Symmetry: D2
Subunit: 474 residues, 4 copies
C-alpha cells in the first residue's frame, strides 16, 4: 500500500526491506514502514551528532519557535493524522484526534517551559570562610542525542512528551515509534519536517526488534534513552544503558482504595472511566478495586449497571470498548479471565470474545490467589477485592511490584493524606480516578513501574545536565 | 588482636573470617576487618529495611539532630581517627585529620540542607481550563535503602558525602568502605553508633570482592547504589543496578588549558598543587597540561623547579609525596613513566622508585601516542602537551573518555566562558586548579567519569523521589 | 536601683536620664533602662553604618557561627532571662522561658537558612535571539541598617525574628525593644555581647516615644524598619518611612469558622487555647467564633465549661490568665466587656476585675452592633457570633479591618480550601487554632493587619535586595 | 478634533471636559483626551472591583490567551500606533514602532511566565518535631486592583510592563497614562478592548493632576500602585500609599566607569549609544563618565567625534536627537548647562537651542561642584569626570542619590565583579552600556531610584500575595 519513509538528515528515505502494517480492528493493510538496517541506524546517529552543535548554538527562543510551528501544523492536520492513528491502533477516532491535540499542547508547553530553565549562582562562603570570594555560576546544558521510544497505545502523544522537552534544551532526537504505530509516528515526523528544523536535529527510526532492538540502545552515540513500554524491555534497556541516563515508563496496576465514608456514586463513575478507557489499554488506570466490605455490595452493583452502559464496537464508531491491539494480547487477557473463574471469582457481566474484541467484564470476589489481582491485563477486565481494613488495603496495594498511581475514595482528607504517604506509588488522586492528567504535574512510578520523573518541567531537567564555572572575585 | 567489627543492627559483629590490613608505607599490621559472608550481608539489608519505616517516621529535625551529633563526635576525635587513617592509606597526617574535619563539615551541611528541601504546589489551570480546580501537592520522599561505597583515597570523606545526604531524607544506609581503608570506615561507624541512631538505620559491610562484590549490588533489597571507584567496576555496577538509580564517581584526566595571556607563576603554582596532591592519587586533579607553545618553555621551567621542591617521604612527616597505595599501583605508574621515556618524552626529573614510593616526575613534549597522554595514573607523574591553538587544546581535552573537570588559565574571562561551554566536563575553574572544593557546589563528570550530580543539595535530590497528591478544590 | 544599659558600638552605656520599670502584676520596681537622647541615637546609627561594610565582608558561615553562639547562650540562660521577662510583662513563668527557647530556635534556623539563599543565572536568549550570549548573574545583598522594634507581648521572641534574619544577610541592627519589656530586650543584648559580634553590628535603643519615637524612624541612616505594634503606630511608620522598605505586624481579629460537620470537642479545645493564651494578648489568636446555628448550643456549652477550668492568678504561678500589661489596657477591655453586657449579649462567665487582672469571659449571642464583634481587645474576652450559612460567616469575617489568620473547623476539606481562598487573611488553619506556628512557615496579614511577609526565609528575602551583573560570553 | 475616549467597564467614554494634546516637535494638535472627574475615577474603580472575582476565577491559561491576543493585535497595528506615538512624544518613528513591538514582547512573555505560577509545601517537622504532621500549602493570589501609571518616554512599553504581569495573576487594572502620551495609551487600550477581556478587567483613566492626581493614588479601592516617573512624585506616592504595596521606577544618573585597560573604542561607542538615545530622555542611560585620567584624553576625543556624527531634527526623520518633551524640560537642561559652563566645564560640542531642540553636548572637565555631575538632565548633555583611582570612581558613583545601573569598562573581570559588589545600583553591565535589556532580567534601583524589583517574573511576584493553608496529616 502506501510506502512510508523515515526522516533522516533532512531527507525522506525508504529501506530495502519493509514491514506491512494492518488495522487491529479489521486486518486491512494500512501501509508499510521501512525495516532499517544497523548501517541505516548508524547514519541516523551520525547525522544527529553532526547537527547537535549548531542546534545547541541557537537561542532558546529560536528552538521554541520551531516547536510552536510543529504544534501548529499538528492542530491543522489533526483530522488527517487522527484518521490513520485510529485505524493503526484500534483507538476511537475522536480519541485519536484527542491524542494529536494533546501532543500539540504538550509540545507548546514544553517550548515555553524550556526557555525558562534558569541557572544558579552558588557562594563558597556558605561552606567555608576561606572560599568567600569563590562563586559558582551553574547553567543547564543538553545531554546530546536522545533516543525516544513511544508505545503503541499513545505512539504520537507519548512521543511528543519526550521529543519536545529534549529539543528545547538543545538535544537532538532519534525517534523510534512502535511498529504498530509507526505510520502515525512517521506522520508526526512530517510536522517536524515541515516546521523546517535543521537537518539532523530530528530523525526517525523504524524496523524489527530482532534486527535493531538492542542495537539502537547499545549504540555509543546515544546519550539518553527515554522509553515507554513493557517492563521486560525496560529492564533490558536499563542494563544496556550501562551508566547512561534513562527514563522508563513501564506497567501499572493502579489500586482504587474505597473507604466506608466514600461517595459511592462518584467512586463508581470514576472507576468506570478509569478502568475501561481504551479497553483498559492504559498504564495509568484503575486496575484493581480494594473496597471495604460494608460498602462493597453497593459499589459493585453501581459499577455493574454502568459497565452495561458502555458501548462496544469499532474505532470508527467511537465505541468505548474497541478490539484489543492484537490476538496475543486478547489471548493473554482470556488466560487471566479463566484463572479467576477457575479460582472462584464472579463475573457480573458477560464474558464474550469476537475476534480480539472482548466485552467489558466486572469480576467480584477476586482473591490474592488469582493472577488477575496482580498482573496488568491491558484488557477490559476489572477485579474487585474486598478488604476488612485500611491496613489490609495498604498491604495488598503495596505488595504489587507496580507503583504508578493510586486512587483514594473517602471524605476524611487528613486520613487520605496519611494513606497516600504509605502507598508505594508516584501519584495519589483523592476522590478521582488515576491519570497522567495535566501534563505539568509530575508523572512517575515506584518499584517496577519505571525510572525518572516525567511531566513537562521534570522531563526537561532529566534530559539536561549542568556545567559549573567557578572563579574568584576581585 | 585488633580485630575490628562491623556495625549491624545496633550491635558490633565479628565474622568467622577476617582480613588483615597493613600500612602501605611501613608494611605494619594495623588490624583486621571482618570478611563477611553472603548471609551476613543479607542480615544487614534485612535490618535496614526493617528499620526504615520508623526512621522515615521521625521529623526532619530529629534526623538532623542525630547527624549533627555524629559530626560533633568526628570533630572531637579528629586526631585519633586521622592517626589511623594516615597509616591505613599512607596519607599525610595533617591531610588525614583534614579529611575527618571535612567529613564533619559535609555531615553538618547535609543535615541542614536536608531540612530545607521544600515541596511544590502545581495548578491544573496552568495547562488546562477544565482542570483549574485541581492542584498537585508534591513532596519529597526517601528511596529506601542506599548502598554507599567509598574509595581508598577518601574512605571517610567520600563515605560521609553519601551517608549524610541519604540519612537526612529518610533513607537507611549500608556502608561498604574499601578494604584498604575499612578500619578507617569502621572508625567512622563508631561515631554513628555513639550518636545513637536507631538500630538498622546505619550499618557497615566489609569483605572480599570475590565473595561479596557483586552480591551487595545485585541484592534486590538495595534501592540505590552510590559509588566512588574504578571505571571498570563502575560500568559493572551500572549493569547490575538494572533500572535502579545510581550515583557514580569514576576516574578523571583533568586538563589544565594554559593560554598565552595566563599568569604563568600562578598557573605553575596551581598546577603543582593540583597535580601532586596526595601523590596524584585524586580523581579531581590536574593530570595533563595543554599549553600554548609561546609560553610553554617558561611555564615548564617553573613547574620543573617546583617539582624538585616537593617533599618526599612518610605520612607521619606530612611529605607532599608519600608511598602509593599498593605495589600493583606503583608498578602501573612506573610502566606509564617508562612508556613516556621510552617513547621520547623529555623527562625533567629523574626516574626513581623505592618500595612503592615513586618520586615526582615531569614530562615535557608528551604526544598523543604516549599512554601518559590519556591513562589515569593515580601516581606522581605529570605530562605537558604543547598546543598551537585553543581550538587544538579543546579537541585534545574532549578526546579523552574522561570528563570530570578542567582548568583554564587566562585573563580573558568572556573567552574563558566560551571555552568552558565547549569542554565536556562537569566543572571548569578559571585560574585555579580543579577541585571538588566547596561541597555545596555541584560535583559531576561527563562521559566515563561518572553518573549523577553530587554536591550536598544535588546528592539529597538524587537519593529522594517524589510523591504527588492530587485533589480538587470545591 | 537596678540600672540597665544599652549596648552601643561594643560598649554598655547608661544615659543621663532613665525610665523605671515596674512589674505589671505587683507594681514592684524591676529596674530601669536608659532614656536616650536624639544625639545618642545618632551615635548608635553612626556606629552601625560604620561597622556594616566589615560585617558584610565576612563570609556567610562566619555570620552564621556568631548567631549560633547567641542561640547557645540564650539556651543556657533561658531560666535566668525568662524569670525577668515573666515579671516584666506579667507572662506565666514557664511561658516566658518558652519564649526564650523559641527565640534561640529562630536564631539558629535563620542562621542556617541565610547561608543557603542561592543566586540565579538568567539567559538573554530566553527573551531574544540577539542576546543569547548575554547572561545575568543575580546575587542577594543586604539593605544596610535595619531598625528592629519588638512588641510588649514578645519583646525577645519578636526581636530575634527580625534580628537574626537581618544579621545573617549582612545587615547591621539597631534594636528598639518596647519600654515595658526593655529590660528583657537588654538581657537579649547580653547574649549578643557575649557571642562577641563586631562593635557596631548589633546595638540597642531605649527611651521615651515622646523624645525619640518618630526620630528613630525618620532618621536617614535607617534603611529598613521592621516593626510589631499597634495599628496606629504602624500606620504612621509607613508614612515616615517614605519609599523605604518596611515590615509591619499589627493587630488581628482572627475568626474561627465552625461548620455543621465540625468535631465540636476538638473545636472547643482549639478555640480555648487560641483565644485565651497569655490572657488574649496575642495578635494571632481566635478573637471571634462564627458558628453555624445548628451546632452553636453544644459548642458554646463546651467552651463555657472549659473557660471555668482556666487558672487565674500570678505570673509566678503559671496561671493561664494573668494581669494585663497595664491599667489603660485593662480599662479598655473592661469597657468592651460592659458594652457587650449592656447591649444584651449572653455572658456565660462572671464579670470580674481585680487590679488589672480581668477574669476570662465568654459572650454568646454577640451581634455586629457590639464593639466586641470588631475591636481587638487584647484581653481575655471571647465573642460567639451565630451564623446561618458559610456565606454569612465569610461576609462577617471579611468585613473586619483585620485579616491576619482564620481557622476553619469542618470535616469537608475541599470545601475548606474553597472557603480559605475567599477569606481575606494571610493564613488559614484547618481544624486547628490560628498561630504564627513553625516559624519556617510564612506569616503575613491582609488589610490593616500589616505589610510584608514574615517567617524565616521570607524575612531574609525582605531584608535583602538583589545585585545583577550582566556580561557577554565570547 | 479627534476626541479620544477612556475604556471604562467595557465601554468607551468621553468626559464633560477634555485636554487637547499637541505634538512636542511641531506644536500641531493631535487630538484630545478626557479630563476625568473624581466621580468618573470612582466609577472606574467600582467597575474593576466588581469584575475582579470573576477574572480571578478564570484559569491561568485563559488569562494568558487573552494576553496573547492583545499582543497579536499590537503587532498587527505596530505602524499605526507607532505613527501617533512618534508625534505625541517626539520620538523617532522607527523607535516609536520599536516601542510597540517590545510591548507585545513583554505581554507575551508575562502571559507565559505567569501561567507557570506554582506554590510550595512546607514541613512543620523542619522546625519542630511536634509539628511533623503539620504541612503548609502555600499558593499565590492577586492583590486585587492595580493602578498602573506609565511615563511620557515609554507610555505604551512601560504600561505593558505593569499591565500584563498584573493581569496574568488575576488582578484587575486601572491604567493612567501620562497626559502627554495619553492618546497612545488609549490606543493601547483599543487592543485590550478588541481582545475582548471581560468588562471591568482593564480600564483607562485620563485627566489633570491638579484634579485627580492624588485622588487616584489615595483611593481606598486601589490595592497596589505601580508607577514610573519623577522622584518627587514617587516620594509623594510612597507616603500616600500608607501600608499598601507599591512599585516605583524613578530617576537615574547611571555612571560609566572607565579603567585604564578598557577597550576605548568599544567604550566610546557604548557611551554614545547609551547617553544620547532619545536625546537623553531615558532613566537607564549613561549620564556621567568616570574615567581614569591616563586614558581620558583619548576616550574624550573618540566621543567628541562620535557626537558630531549624531543626527539632529524631527521624529518623522528618525533623528537621533529630537526636540525635548516640553519647554520647561528644555529650560531645566539649559540651566544645568549654564552652571557647568560658568564653573569651568569645557563644552567640546556646540551649545545650541532652537525651540526645545537642544543639540548634543559633550562636557569635559566636569567637577563634583557642578549640578550636571549629579542631577538627571533628561537632555542630550554628557559630563566627563576624570578620576585618578578606582577608589575615587566608586566613591563619586556611590555619592549619588540615584542607583539604577552602572557600566564598568575594563578587561579585568574578577576586579570588575569586585567593583560591581561595591556599587550601590541594581544592575551592573560589564563592557556594555546600561539598559533595562532583556525584560526577563531583573530591573531595579537602589536609593532614590525606586522601590521594588521589576523584570517579568519579579513584577509578577510583586503584584501577588500569598495564601497559606495549614493542616495536619492523620
Amino acid at each position: 500500500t502506501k510506502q512510508y519513509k523515515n526522516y533522516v538528515n533532512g531527507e525522506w528515505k525508504l529501506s530495502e526491506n519493509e514491514i506491512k502494517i494492518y488495522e487491529p480492528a479489521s486486518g486491512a493493510e494500512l501501509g508499510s514502514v521501512p525495516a532499517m538496517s544497523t548501517e541505516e541506524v548508524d547514519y541516523v546517529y551520525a547525522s544527529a551528532k553532526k547537527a547537535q552543535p549548531a542546534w545547541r548554538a541557537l537561542s532558546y527562543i529560536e528552538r521554541a519557535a520551531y516547536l510552536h510551528k510543529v504544534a501548529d501544523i499538528l492542530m491543522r492536520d489533526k483530522e488527517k493524522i487522527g484518521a490513520i492513528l485510529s485505524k493503526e491502533v484500534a483507538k476511537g477516532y475522536k480519541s485519536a484526534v484527542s491524542e494529536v491535540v494533546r501532543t500539540a499542547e504538550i509540545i507548546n508547553y514544553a517550548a515555553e517551559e524550556g526557555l525558562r530553565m534558569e541557572g544558579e549562582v552558588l557562594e563558597g562562603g556558605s561552606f567555608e570562610a576561606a572560599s568567600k570570594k569563590k562563586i559558582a555560576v551553574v547553567r543547564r546544558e543538553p545531554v546530546g542525542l536522545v533516543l525516544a521510544i513511544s508505545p503503541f497505545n499513545y505512539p504520537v502523544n507519548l512521543a511528543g512528551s519526550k521529543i519536545a522537552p529534549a529539543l528545547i534544551a538543545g538535544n537532538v532526537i532519534a525517534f523510534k515509534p512502535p511498529t504498530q504505530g509507526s505510520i502515525s509516528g512517521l506522520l508526526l515526523a512530517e510536522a517536524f519536517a515541515e516546521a523546517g528544523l535543521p537537518a539532523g536535529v530530528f530523525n526517525t527510526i523504524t524496523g524489527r526488534g530482532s534486527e535493531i532492538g538492542d542495537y539502537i540502545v547499545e549504540h555509543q552515540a546515544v546519550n539518553f534513552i527515554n522509553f515507554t513500554g513493557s517492563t521486560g524491555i525496560g529492564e533490558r534497556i536499563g542494563k544496556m544503558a550501562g551508566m547512561r541516563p534513562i527514563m522508563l515508563e513501564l506497567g501499572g496496576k493502579d489500586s482504587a482504595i474505597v473507604l466506608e465514608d466514600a461517595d459511592l456514586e462518584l467512586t463508581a463513575k470514576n472507576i468506570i472511566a478509569g478502568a475501561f478507557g481504551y479497553s483498559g489499554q492504559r498504564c495509568t488506570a484503575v486496575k484493581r478495586v480494594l473496597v471495604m466490605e460494608s460498602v462493597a455490595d453497593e459499589l459493585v452493583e453501581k459499577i455493574r449497571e454502568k459497565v452495561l452502559a458502555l458501548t462496544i464496537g469499532n474505532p470508527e464508531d467511537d465505541a468505548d470498548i474497541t478490539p484489543l491491539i492484537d490476538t496475543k494480547s486478547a489471548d493473554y487477557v482470556e488466560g487471566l479471565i479463566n484463572d479467576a473463574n477457575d479460582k472462584g471469582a464472579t463475573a457480573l457481566t458477560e464474558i464474550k470474545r469476537e475476534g480480539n474484541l472482548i466485552c467489558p467484564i466486572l469480576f467480584d470476589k477476586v482473591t490474592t490467589d488469582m493472577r488477575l489481582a496482580w498482573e496488568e491485563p491491558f484488557g477490559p477486565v476489572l477485579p474487585i477485592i474486598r478488604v476488612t481494613s485500611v491496613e489490609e488495603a495498604i498491604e495488598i496495594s503495596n505488595k504489587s511490584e507496580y507503583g504508578l498511581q493510586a486512587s483514594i475514595f473517602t471524605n476524611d482528607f487528613p486520613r487520605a493524606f496519611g494513606i497516600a504517604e504509605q502507598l508505594e506509588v508516584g501519584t495519589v488522586h483523592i476522590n478521582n480516578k488515576t491519570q497522567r492528567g495535566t501534563d505539568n504535574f509530575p508523572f512517575l512510578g515506584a518499584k517496577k513501574s519505571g525510572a525518572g520523573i516525567q511531566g513537562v518541567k521534570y522531563s526537561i531537567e532529566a534530559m539536561t545536565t549542568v556545567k559549573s564555572v567557578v572563579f574568584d572575585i576581585k
